[PDB]
Write a structure and sequence with these properties.
Dehydroquinate synthase-like, alpha domain; binds chloride ion; alpha/beta; 2 domains; oxidoreductase; Rossmann fold; 9% strand; NADPH-dependent Aldehyde reductase; binds zinc ion; 380 residues; 6-stranded parallel beta sheet
């Protein structure tokens, strides 16, 4: 079908790609470097950024938490306008990136009016933003900000809060703990199938590219765990994951996201890692939705898993089992019971879904609360 695709961020990719950073920022810029909990200090990544920019007018602002608080981001907005920062540089992961996107937009929001209507409008009304770039220590318009003061977390998208550039050096991913490496692989995999294992619309390029991402993650994802400092492996996983999060594969095709929406309630209620909730929900959801997803499940089985023999139901069953096994071999269990959850929380989960308006989920808008109930139950 029809689509509007825009991917303006310049990618600087590869070993030592930070060598390209300095030339992207005006020599006379006043740069604010933003970061999270301080691990980038310990790894030496922040020092590499500081060295790359040596001689330039550089300031620092850290402490951006996972689920960046509206509190802290406003403090940065304060420093920015007070010190007349002209460029923002996010160093870290998606949390640092997202919070920095908000700072960039909030800063050119008018003087007096409150920046929270960025979130109320999903960034629809952003006309301009402080230029920003990033140095990503793992793959990441699109930012989810929390007020935490009573537990908010809304999203916003704007063609202006998109980074002008992103430095992606696979070497910076070598230090990620196995838990984070596996979670990243699962999350990339699921972001891809949220946009591919849906309904056939004869979007051949989108299908091939999605298939390509999945095949790459299955081949090199496990290797990233076994061989954490294998550059080629870590590079393929980083670049594949970037495409899984990026836009080409979703442009003009049906999108699901029900696995994400169901998974989100497991994180909110039980504190499970994002990717753990996806590994649990996806295979249960696929079995439940095997009717509407039938054609793309069979295409997935053939194109990604080389499953060609047997009935349609046998092929789909084998594809679901192969996917489950892939997640488990990455060290990411796929049943609620693996995490000590017996399913007694499902009534509370369904109440939260209803509270959050998640009552018509999926590409067919047909995953109602009774369907979500069956999916959680099957995931036990
Ligand atoms: Cl210079
Ligand atoms: Zn995700």
């Amino acid at each position: 079908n029809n689509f509007n695709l825009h991917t303006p961020t310049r990618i600087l990719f590869g070993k030592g790609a930070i060598a390209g950073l300095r030339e992207q920022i005006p020599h006379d810029a006043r740069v604010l470097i933003t970061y999270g909990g301080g691990s980038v200090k310990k790894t030496g990544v922040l020092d590499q950024v500081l060295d790359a920019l040596k001689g330039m007018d550089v300031l620092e602002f850290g402490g951006i938490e996972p689920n960046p608080a509206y509190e802290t981001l406003m403090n940065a907005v304060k420093l920015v306008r007070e010190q007349k920062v002209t460029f923002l540089l996010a160093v870290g992961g998606g949390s640092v990136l997202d919070g920095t996107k908000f700072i960039a937009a909030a800063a050119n929001y008018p003087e007096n009016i409150d920046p929270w209507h960025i979130l109320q409008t999903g960034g629809k009304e952003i006309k301009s933003a402080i230029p920003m770039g990033c140095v990503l220590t793992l793959p990441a318009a699109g930012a989810v900000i929390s007020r935490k003061t009573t537990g908010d977390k809304q999203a916003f998208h704007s063609a202006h809060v998109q980074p002008v550039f992103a430095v992606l050096d696979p070497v910076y991913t070598y230090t990620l703990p196995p838990r984070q490496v596996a979670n990243g692989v699962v999350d990339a995999f699921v972001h891809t199938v949220e946009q591919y294992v849906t309904k056939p619309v004869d979007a051949k390029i989108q299908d091939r590219f999605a298939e390509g991402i999945l095949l790459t993650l299955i081949e090199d994802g496990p290797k990233a765990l076994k061989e954490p400092e294998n550059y080629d492996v870590r590079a393929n996983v980083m670049w594949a994951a970037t495409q899984a999060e990026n836009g080409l594969i979703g442009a003009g095709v049906p999108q699901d996201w029900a696995t994400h929406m169901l998974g989100h309630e497991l994180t909110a209620m039980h504190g499970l890692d994002h990717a753990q909730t996806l590994a649990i929900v996806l295979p249960a959801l696929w079995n439940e939705k095997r009717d509407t997803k039938r054609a793309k499940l069979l295409q997935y089985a053939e194109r990604v898993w080389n499953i060609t023999e047997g009935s349609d139901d046998e092929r789909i069953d084998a594809a679901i089992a192969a996917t489950r096994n892939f997640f488990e071999q990455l060290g990411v269990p796929t049943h609620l019971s693996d995490y000590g959850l017996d399913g007694s929380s499902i009534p509370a989960l369904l109440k939260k879904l209803e509270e959050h308006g998640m009552t018509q989920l999926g590409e067919n808008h047909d995953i109602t609360l009774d369907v979500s109930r069956r999916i959680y139950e099957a995931a036990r």
